[PDB]
Design a protein around this ligand. Structure first.
Ligand code: ATP
Ligand code: MG
Lengths: 736, 1078
């Protein structure tokens, strides 16, 4: 271990020394190694340190100078692995050691997840047995063919077949092992380690209790190491020791998400002095994870950093809150498996990976959506280990049988948004431990009094459709869906989120409660069909509230025509946001091409020739991308783009909106300059035959939803139906 | 409602109200006390703590109680339930409040009252009218002593556990007393008088408590933990108790700490401890200030002139030592740099480095010596260390580069030579910045310059180091690349273009080609697209996987931050995606069965203005080509291709709905049949597969069917289309119109495009004609208790389903046995098309016979296949059918939970028909009898049955010997027999029929092997899950399947034999069996 190059904040546990020892001896004797162990067993770190420690002649130590040079050839082992991949890796190292010094240069293979493809459907690890004896198969054994092998696995491995190697089957890290690793990780600074040495043993005891508590392997060693590094960094930055809030924050951050685990209670029981009696919520934990400090990552190298975050949710709600009250200043890119018709998955994941790489190099946050298709191309970047060079971090990103190092900026954060069920039953535990878990589904952000706002608004909008009238001889009960188009028994939560975000101040003064309730009412009625707002005179609300809400619906809010809405929108400024994104739901027919021409005709002052986009033709994502690129490229200011989406038709353009929306915003975030405003409007045509109730709710966050009855202006009828309520048909024909 | 809203938030509702109206104020108080209650999903408490917490935290309950107790004319009229609740609240308060006069109070409620002192004092003064001060102060003092001793225990436990690796100490009873939570009665603390208070922490003696007090006084003192650890090493395993640790381990530590104390107090310390115990305070003193202040905490003595001058000595010694280190490293880099020069002030410095001194005072003569090296840096000498140990690097630079100007071109020579990867392209820049920074001492250095110039150069290097603190690491990782730095200047022709350069090349002159290769290999998407990159005249071909990994490589290029590179790479990626997608739609069409794209081929010129070049494998239609940008042309071509695919699936569904017999074969068998039937002398594969409709089809009957199917009216129509089409092609200027019209005419009139095949209409007519010549149609009535107009669902049982079906079909004695039609033996992952074909065969009007159509093992179909099958069945019953069909579905009795058994619950016949085993046996054995005058291989068998299953309880008996002796008995008669004996050893588990089919293929596709061939299948004992389906498919149904290829038909005259060793036991008895014994 001492001969190997040093690394600060590395623990001298029996684990790490044992793996690097067995590794250096086996690849010297060319003996297969089958290092297994639970996540956090330092097998991969052992592989990296062995690779960078056994260079032949330029070795830092004289003992590694007298030893051979090693050139491994990595090969990630996804469960969808083929024996051709390992055969190719073996042939590659056979060429590598061909013609070089056998006694000073040796090339080996590493299958970082070999245990994963033990039950792959394509029988991948079934020709490895002859391979690890005579170098290659279906050919003569020969020199420059014998190759080492380190079958690293994070899962229990079949011993019968792989007996020919050396099974270093790491056991469960014992309490003494955990305290030793605890001492070794904080070795970077001698001074604070002697201040924080006491907490180490109870930490290990509590960690073993929690790991043996749940049968599921939801928590592991990586979380413990992150916890100890986090407390190390907090103490060293604070320089005065530890306050209990820091310890509880650390354990909460690195231990959370699991439903049946009060890990805070478990840790604080063994640490009665480290109690906290105040409430700390998930929102500030996310804010700390995603926004590290200016004093953070400000000294030499990056040894102490947070993990990438994995929010656990349900009903795909995380994005709304995250885009409401966290993603401030700079909006992170959103990556997803685009749902546009006839897009090949391989090209899409390649493009997503390229965008990920661009974001990492630049240093702009990434928010993922699908991991069950790009987990094998990220866990190395989610390993958070860096191959330093020139003082710059570099990580491994892999595409198929091709792994390549790539730059990572020092200001870069990653968020994976997944639901509770999918992670708890489909997510691999190594990914779980590589990712800092956190649950923020729908209620965590929501204060209890905000839940009361939700229920009061629920009962307020449940009787908004409750109208009993004999103006017609008919009995048809109105659902709250039809009065407020989109409402889906959940839109109250999203709308109150929007309301509190709009208020911003976010305190309790008994005035903010009233005003957030009233703004929530305004946002509800802003998506209300005009017929409902005029029936509201006789509905169970009353007949003064009816007048007031009709006034707000026809005077303050703009709902006559799309063009009037655009004028009112572009006239006013915003919350310093370079762009404002609005969703429009309509019953009239979608614009047909001369309408946008006249639309610009009375928008000759502000708009920049808005372009309409039909979503039935974009049988590829890149058609939409190139259209958006062209619209951003054309000169002007305060440009406007409109996307039509007829939900009532034979087409499938119903869920595709989702993909399109992200794409558009993504394009702006990566294709808009720094000197032009942008307004994106998404328009959809709905019917009154029930398709106006089966439409999803108020997609919150970065979409201001609103409802326009008819897009086209009306010169014939007046633009204010309250006067038409006042007057009769006779009064419409009076002479001057 | 409004007060419920207001108290739902944490605001105050009533604070200064002038509300002398008594009844109405009582009503609003009832509202607040029924709506400010701690609701927890609907009146759950069953406890008193939460009520007390709400009592002590709410700013309106104390005002409410005040107002209700001021006058007696308000409480009387509030509400029955509200008065009940406030009576409960007052009772709860009285219960928790009579408790504080005693020790029965709980600690949690006690801290709760201490954190709401004002609320609690007001409510207690309120309840007094129906001591407070002294009782509460005494109680809080008792709590303070409680927490003091608890923290003493905590710190002692933590310190004794920090050395837990050396020694174990049993903590009397505290190890369990301290373990439990703080939810116990205060009376357990036993605050006694006559004074001392012995609590639940049974401290052995107050000496342990005062030791704990001192230890907590130096719990954080780093020096104290070092002393305690080194004195704990003196014991070493040992299970030792608390009382003897005080003098075994604590007393020596405290004594050493006390003596070292008076040693620093005297200022007589020596340098040995200075560099022995103060070695971790390098360049950090403020926390050392506080640590040394913690040092003076233990002794109740002042600190006025003790830490300041002593920490000054510490910092001056540290500065001295770092100055020695800097001086030695600067001399080292000097002597390695080759400069003689002169400093003439560091010789006394190194002489002192070779000196040893013992005193803790101020070196006074060394002030001037260290003046030149006071504040160089604590960092930044590592850069010079690296410079010193990298002699090879600087020697190579001064043997290769030697100047600053040519570097500007040198890195350029590197940039082309460097690889495409991010590491490869960043190597050049890191080396460039390293040499740019280090030219301060590497280029401005003469063999003789004085001290002042050296220091000025060091200063300008310092100001070159302020913006990039990684410069030494850049030097390190550039020096580690010395071989590349050597080979870049002597670079030969690097023959590897790039990932991005080859992107530009393939974009410049790429030729994508789709061929549907005429060679024998499959039609997989990998082998249907190739790429041509021409040049000279060399032309490199590219496969799909090579292109995909190319996409990976150029997708992981570094950051060039230019429009050209990213635009061209994404253009190449986009054209590749569209090309793959056209391949996707084309292969979907090919697997649908087209005959128009079998000889299709397409060249796509990735070059700008390169267009497309279509081609069809017929002489009567000329080539089709376009021009223009490739991306929107390809988008249009793909849209049109998908629309044509939809129209083609529609037209094949419609045409299959008209001819029944053309619903027999799968789509690829349709294309093969259409190809083959035009041959004058068709091969034996299609003859065999026609023997499943006509039966024993021959050339004469097939030519009769293909000659009496067409009329000269069809020929006139084809001549009309031929004379009409080319001007229609020339009518539309661009290719899109002529493409649309050629594909439309293909849909309407196909057979003229390829006068070497048959369209769907001609095929259906031919099959119908073969049906007409092949008479004696097959009739099969239903069993008793089975309805004849609706699905007949049966849930038999996994070991009875197959005999159930074989008994259902028994009710037609002397009727020809069923074949792959009307009897579908389902397996997991069965193609949907086969069940669609079965449903069609059972619901078409043209059948010239009533037959029972059975779907065995229905639950074994997958979920999605079952869903599609049920959707198709409902649709086909919706459009039209014949309402006399016999449909039987069989499922497994224990597998009712799957899709198709669950969806036929209403259509259930809970009858489960079956027949006695001898009846099924007689049925099968009699129906296997080969009639005389056929010259069959069954003549040697037990009088002509052509099927035998050979089994035995244990192996090694001679079953194979029986097979071979039967073969040689046949050889004995009918001399010159040359009878083949095929052997197939089905051996893998999860048995596959395709292997045995393929092994059987080359044997009757020749017609010169029509002679009796005694086949002999054999099996291995690792086939556990695949015996019955295959046995019944081959021996009973007489067919062998493949989703996309020819069909093998068991024939009446080729003897078959299946060995099987010893669930299945009942099954083997069905067939005419032979068994052997030791
Ligand atoms: N000895 C150690 N001391 C401190 N931290 C360690 C030690 N070994 C590993 N770690 C931590 O573990 C992480 C690296 O783990 P690593 O990738 O090597 O996992 P592994 O147990 O080898 O398994 P896998 O094969 O899944 O990668 C880092 O976050 C690092 O801080
Ligand atoms: Mg045998």
């Amino acid at each position: 271990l001492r001969g190997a190059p040093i690394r600060t904040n590395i623990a001298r546990n029996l684990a790490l020394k044992e793996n690097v020892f067995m590794m250096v001896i086996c690849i010297e004797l060319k003996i297969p190694l089958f290092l297994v162990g639970k996540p956090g067993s330092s097998k991969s770190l052992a592989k990296i340190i062995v690779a960078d420690a056994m260079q032949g002649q330029a070795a830092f130590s004289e003992l590694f100078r007298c030893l051979k040079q090693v050139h491994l050839v990595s090969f990630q082992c996804s469960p969808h692995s083929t024996p051709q991949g390992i055969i190719s890796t073996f042939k590659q190292c056979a060429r590598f050691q061909q013609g070089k010094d056998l006694g000073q240069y040796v090339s080996v293979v590493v299958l970082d997840q070999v245990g994963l493809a033990e039950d792959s459907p394509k029988m991948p690890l079934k020709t490895l047995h002859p391979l690890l004896e005579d170098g290659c198969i279906e050919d003569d054994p020969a020199p420059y063919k014998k190759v080492g092998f380190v079958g690293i696995s994070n899962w229990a491995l079949d011993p019968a077949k792989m007996n020919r190697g050396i099974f270093v089957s790491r056991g469960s890290p014992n309490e003494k092992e955990l305290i030793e690793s605890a001492e070794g990780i904080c070795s970077s600074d001698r001074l604070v380690q002697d201040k924080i040495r006491g907490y180490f043993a109870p930490f290990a005891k509590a960690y073993e209790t929690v790991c043996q508590k749940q049968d599921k392997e939801f928590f592991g060693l990586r979380d413990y190491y992150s916890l100890i590094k986090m407390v190390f960094a907090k103490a060293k930055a604070s320089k005065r020791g530890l306050s209990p809030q820091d310890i509880t924050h650390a354990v909460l951050r690195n231990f959370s998400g699991k439903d049946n685990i009060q890990a805070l209670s478990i840790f604080t029981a063994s640490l009665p002095e480290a109690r906290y009696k105040e409430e700390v919520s998930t929102v500030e934990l996310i804010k700390q994870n995603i926004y590290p400090g200016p004093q953070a990552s400000s000294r030499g190298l990056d040894g102490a950093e947070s993990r990438y975050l994995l929010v656990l949710t349900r009903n795909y709600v995380a994005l709304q809150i995250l885009q409401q009250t966290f993603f401030e200043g700079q909006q992170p890119e959103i990556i997803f498996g685009s749902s546009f018709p006839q897009d090949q998955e391989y090209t899409q994941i390649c493009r997503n990976i390229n965008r990920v790489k661009i974001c990492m190099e630049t240093g702009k946050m990434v928010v993922l959506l699908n991991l069950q298709n790009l987990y094998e191309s990220l866990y190395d970047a989610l390993n958070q280990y860096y191959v330093y060079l020139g003082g710059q971090k570099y990580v491994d990103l892999g595409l198929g049988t091709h792994r390549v190092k790539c730059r990572v900026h020092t200001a870069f954060r990653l968020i994976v948004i997944e639901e509770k069920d999918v992670v708890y039953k489909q997510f691999p535990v190594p990914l779980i431990n590589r990712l800092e878990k956190h649950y923020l589904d729908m209620n965590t952000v929501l204060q209890p009094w905000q839940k009361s706002i939700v229920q009061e608004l629920q009962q307020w909008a449940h009787e908004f459709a409750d109208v009993k009238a004999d103006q017609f001889i008919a009995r048809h009960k109105y659902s709250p869906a039809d009065v407020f188009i989109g409402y889906h028994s959940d839109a109250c939560a999203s709308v109150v989120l929007q309301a509190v975000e709009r208020q911003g101040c976010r305190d309790l003064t008994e005035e903010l409660y009233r005003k957030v309730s009233e703004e929530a009412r305004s946002i509800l009625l802003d998506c209300a069909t005009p017929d409902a707002v005029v029936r509201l005179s006789g509905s169970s609300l009353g007949s003064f509230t009816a007048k007031q809400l009709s006034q707000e619906y026809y005077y303050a809010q703009q709902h006559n025509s799309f063009v009037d809405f655009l004028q009112a929108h572009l006239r006013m400024t915003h919350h310093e946001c370079r762009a404002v994104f609005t969703e429009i739901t309509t019953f009239s027919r979608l614009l047909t091409g001369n309408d946008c021409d006249v639309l610009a005709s009375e928008l000759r002052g502000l708009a920049s020739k808005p372009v309409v986009l039909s979503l039935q033709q974009y049988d590829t994502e890149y058609s939409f991308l190139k259209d958006v690129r062209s619209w951003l490229t054309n000169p002007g200011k305060r440009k406007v783009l409109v996307i039509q989406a007829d939900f009532d038709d034979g087409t499938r353009s119903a869920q595709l909106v989702a993909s399109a929306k992200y794409t558009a915003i993504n394009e702006i975030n990566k294709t808009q300059g720094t000197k032009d405003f942008v307004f994106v409007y998404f328009v959809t045509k709905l019917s009154r035959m029930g398709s106006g109730t089966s439409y999803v709710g108020f997609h919150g966050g970065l979409w201001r939803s609103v409802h326009i009855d008819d897009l086209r202006r009306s010169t014939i009828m007046a633009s204010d139906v309250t006067k038409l309520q006042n007057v009769t048909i006779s009064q419409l024909f009076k002479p001057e | 409602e409004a007060v419920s809203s207001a108290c739902q938030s944490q605001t105050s509702v009533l604070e200064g109200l002038s509300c002398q109206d008594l009844q109405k104020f009582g009503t609003l108080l009832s509202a607040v006390i029924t709506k400010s209650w701690p609701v927890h999903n609907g009146e759950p408490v069953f406890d008193v703590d939460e009520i007390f917490k709400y009592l002590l935290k709410w700013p309106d309950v104390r005002q409410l109680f005040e107002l209700c107790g001021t006058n007696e004319k308000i409480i009387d009229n509030i509400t029955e339930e509200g008065r009940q609740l406030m009576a409960t609240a007052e009772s709860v308060f009285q219960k928790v409040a009579g408790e504080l006069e005693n020790g029965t109070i709980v600690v949690g409620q006690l801290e709760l009252i201490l954190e709401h002192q004002s609320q609690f004092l007001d409510i207690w003064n309120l309840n007094r009218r129906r001591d407070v001060r002294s009782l509460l102060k005494r109680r809080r003092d008792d709590l303070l002593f409680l927490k003091q001793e608890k923290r003493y225990v905590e710190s002692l436990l933590r310190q004794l556990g920090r050395v837990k690796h050396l020694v174990q100490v049993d903590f009397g009873n505290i190890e369990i007393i301290h373990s439990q939570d703080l939810s116990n009665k205060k009376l357990n603390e036993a605050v006694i008088k006559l004074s001392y208070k012995r609590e639940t922490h049974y401290c052995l003696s107050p000496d342990i408590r005062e030791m704990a007090s001192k230890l907590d006084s130096l719990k954080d003192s780093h020096i104290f933990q070092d002393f305690w650890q080194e004195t704990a090493e003196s014991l070493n395993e040992l299970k030792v108790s608390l009382p003897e640790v005080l003098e075994y381990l604590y007393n020596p530590c405290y004594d050493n700490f006390y003596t070292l104390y008076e040693n620093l107090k005297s200022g007589k310390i020596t340098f040995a401890e200075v560099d022995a115990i103060f070695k971790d305070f390098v360049d950090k003193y403020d926390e050392l200030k506080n640590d040394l202040k913690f040092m003076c905490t233990m002794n109740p003595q002042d600190q006025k002139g003790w830490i300041s001058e002593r920490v000054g000595q510490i910092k001056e010694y540290h500065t001295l030592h770092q100055a020695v280190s800097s001086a030695k490293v600067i001399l080292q880099v000097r002597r390695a740099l080759g400069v003689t020069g002169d400093f003439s002030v560091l010789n006394p410095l190194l002489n002192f480095a070779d000196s040893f001194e013992d005193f803790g005072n101020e070196s006074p003569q060394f002030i001037k010596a260290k003046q030149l090296l006071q504040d160089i840096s604590e960092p930044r000498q590592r850069c010079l260390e690296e410079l010193a140990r990298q002699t090879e690097l600087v020697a190579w630079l001064h043997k290769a580069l030697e100047d600053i100007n040519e570097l500007k071109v040198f890195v350029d020579l590197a940039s082309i030579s460097a690889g495409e990867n991010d590491i490869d392209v960043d190597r050049v820049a890191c080396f460039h910045d390293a040499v740019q920074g280090y030219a301060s001492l590497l280029y401005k250095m003469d063999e003789r310059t004085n001290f002042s110039d050296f220091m000025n150069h060091l200063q300008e290097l310092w100001r070159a180091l302020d913006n990039d603190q990684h410069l030494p690491d850049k030097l390190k990782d550039s020096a580690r690349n010395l071989e590349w730095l050597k080979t870049v200047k002597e670079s030969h022709g690097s023959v590897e273009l790039s990932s991005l350069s080859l992107a530009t090349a393939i974009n410049s002159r790429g030729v994508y080609v789709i061929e549907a290769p005429k060679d024998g290999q499959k039609i997989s998407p990998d082998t249907v697209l190739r790429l041509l990159l021409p040049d000279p005249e060399a032309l490199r071909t590219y496969s799909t996987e090579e292109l995909k990994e190319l996409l990976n490589k150029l997708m992981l290029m570094s950051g060039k931050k230019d429009h050209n590179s990213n635009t061209e790479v994404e253009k190449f990626s986009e054209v590749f995606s569209n090309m793959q997608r056209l391949v996707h739609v084309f292969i979907k069409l090919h697997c649908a069965g087209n005959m128009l794209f079998r000889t299709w081929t397409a060249k796509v010129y990735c070059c700008p203005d390169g267009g497309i070049f279509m081609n069809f494998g017929l002489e009567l239609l000329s080539q089709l080509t376009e021009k223009g940008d490739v991306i929107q042309l390809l988008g249009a071509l793909c849209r049109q291709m998908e629309d044509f695919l939809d129209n083609w699936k529609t037209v094949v569904a419609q045409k299959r709905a008209e001819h029944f017999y053309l619903n027999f074969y799968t789509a690829e068998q349709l294309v093969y049949l259409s190809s083959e039937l035009r041959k004058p002398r068709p091969s034996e594969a299609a003859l065999m597969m026609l023997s499943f409709i006509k039966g024993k089809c021959t050339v004469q009957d097939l030519v009769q069917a293909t000659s009496a199917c067409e009329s000269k009216a069809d020929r006139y129509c084809l001549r009309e289309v031929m004379k009409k089409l080319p001007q229609q092609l020339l009518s539309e200027p661009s290719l899109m119109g002529k493409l649309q019209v050629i594909m439309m005419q293909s849909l309407v009139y196909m057979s003229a495009f390829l006068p070497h095949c048959l369209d769907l209409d001609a095929l259906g007519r031919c099959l119908a004609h073969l049906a007409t010549m092949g008479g004696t149609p097959v009739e099969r009535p239903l069993p008793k208790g089975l309805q004849a107009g609706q699905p007949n669902l049966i849930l038999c049982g996994h070991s009875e389903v197959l005999p159930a079906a074989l008994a259902i079909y028994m009710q037609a004695p002397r009727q020809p046995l069923p074949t792959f039609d009307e009897v579908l033996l389902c397996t997991p992952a069965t193609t949907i098309e086969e069940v669609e074909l079965l449903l069609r065969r059972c619901l078409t009007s043209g059948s010239q016979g009533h037959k029972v159509y059975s779907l065995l093992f229905a639950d074994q179909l997958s979920y999605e296949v079952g869903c599609q099958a049920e959707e198709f069945f409902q649709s086909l019953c919706t459009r039209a059918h014949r309402e006399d069909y016999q449909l039987v579905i069989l499922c497994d009795a224990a597998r009712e939970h799957c899709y198709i058994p669950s969806t036929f619950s209403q259509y259930k016949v809970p009858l489960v028909p079956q027949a006695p085993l001898p009846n099924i046996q007689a049925y099968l054995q009699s129906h296997y009898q080969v009639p005389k005058r056929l010259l069959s291989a069954a003549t040697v068998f037990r009088d002509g049955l052509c099927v035998g299953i050979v089994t035995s309880e244990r192996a090694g008996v001679g079953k194979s010997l029986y097979v071979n002796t039967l073969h040689t008995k046949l050889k004995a008669k009918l001399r010159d027999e040359t009878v083949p004996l095929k052997i197939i050893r089905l051996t893998e588990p999860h048995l596959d029929e395709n292997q045995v089919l393929s092994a059987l293929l080359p044997f009757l596709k020749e017609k010169y092997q029509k002679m009796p061939v005694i086949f002999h299948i054999d099996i291995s004992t690792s086939v556990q899950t695949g015996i019955p389906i295959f046995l019944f498919k081959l021996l009973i149904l007489q067919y062998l399947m493949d989703i996309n290829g020819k069909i093998w038909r068991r024939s009446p005259g080729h003897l078959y034999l299946v060995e099987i060793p010893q669930p299945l036991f009942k099954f083997l008895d069905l067939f005419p069996k032979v068994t052997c014994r030791p």
